Amino acid sequence: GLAVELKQSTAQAHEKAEHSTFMSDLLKGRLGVAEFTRLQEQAWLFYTALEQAVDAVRASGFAESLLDPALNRAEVLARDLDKLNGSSEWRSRITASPAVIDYVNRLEEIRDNVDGPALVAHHYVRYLGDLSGGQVIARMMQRHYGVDPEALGFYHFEGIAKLKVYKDEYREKLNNLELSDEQREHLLKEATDAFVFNHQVFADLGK
Numbered sequence: 098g099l100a101v102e103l104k105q106s107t108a109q110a111h112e113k114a115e116h117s118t119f120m121s122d123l124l125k126g127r128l129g130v131a132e133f134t135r136l137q138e139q140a141w142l143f144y145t146a147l148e149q150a151v152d153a154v155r156a157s158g159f160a161e162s163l164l165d166p167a168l169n170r171a172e173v174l175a176r177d178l179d180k181l182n183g184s185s186e187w188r189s190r191i192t193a194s195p196a197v198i199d200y201v202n203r204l205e206e207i208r209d210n211v212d213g214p215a216l217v218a219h220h221y222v223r224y225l226g227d228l229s230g231g232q233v234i235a236r237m238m239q240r241h242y243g244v245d246p247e248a249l250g251f252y253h254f255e256g257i258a259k260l261k262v263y264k265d266e267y268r269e270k271l272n273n274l275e276l277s278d279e280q281r282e283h284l285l286k287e288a289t290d291a292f293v294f295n296h297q298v299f300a301d302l303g304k
């Protein structure tokens with residue numbers, strides 16, 4: 098099934114992400130809320146782009162049931178950032194890191210090409226990760242740095258009750274997508290690239 102092949106083909110990349118110096122240090126308590134806020138600022142940039150691509154692909158009629166708007170993170174992230182930074186001044190201060198420029202550019206290509214299989218790869222890499230492991234990240238930000246849960250809205254998924262069920266249903270939708278061999282290969286390759294972009298975001302944050 099596609100859900101298994103996605104997980105298997107990116108498992109090593111996921112381990113690599115876990116072991117990133119920046120993200121590792123953040124989750125171990127060695128950094129602080131400032132660095133967490135820098136991460137979330139970069140995330141706002143790439144989630145904004147991702148959600149434009151999701152919107153385009155949803156409108157095309159591809160993977161509709163998968164592309165649940167309840168998953169949208171950009172607006173929630175903006176509210177988190179208003180809290181983390183104390184005002185909305187971050188909007189004019191923030192700049193996309195080189196990593197984020199590449200990631201956003203790719204997302205804009207997917208949006209404008211209305212490339213459904215590529216979009217689904219990106220959707221899986223970000224949202225299933227958020228749904229599945231986000232609670233661990235949120236917990237660590239609360240534990241090590243005292244971040245208020247009200248500033249961790251990104252991790253909450255308002256609108257979803259039974260999360261396990263939601264995850265299982267998400268995987269079933271992946272498995273039920275109609276894809277050619279070319280589309281499936283493209284989707285798998287793109288998921289790998291999605292991990293690569295996300296790792297580099299961490300690498301750039303560390304610099």
Ligand code: HEM
Nearest residue numbers: 104114115120221222223225226229230233234292295296
């Ligand atoms: C580059 C950043 C990361 C990305 C893109 C990402 C992506 C993903 C994805 C796509 C899944 C779903 C796997 C599947 O069930 O098919 C996932 C699960 C998960 N993630 Fe991440 N993840 C990242 C970083 C992390 C970090 C740093 C942690 C450390 C807390 C973490 C903890 C988990 C956990 C616990 C799961 C549930 C199961 C599993 O362990 O593999 N993730 N992540």
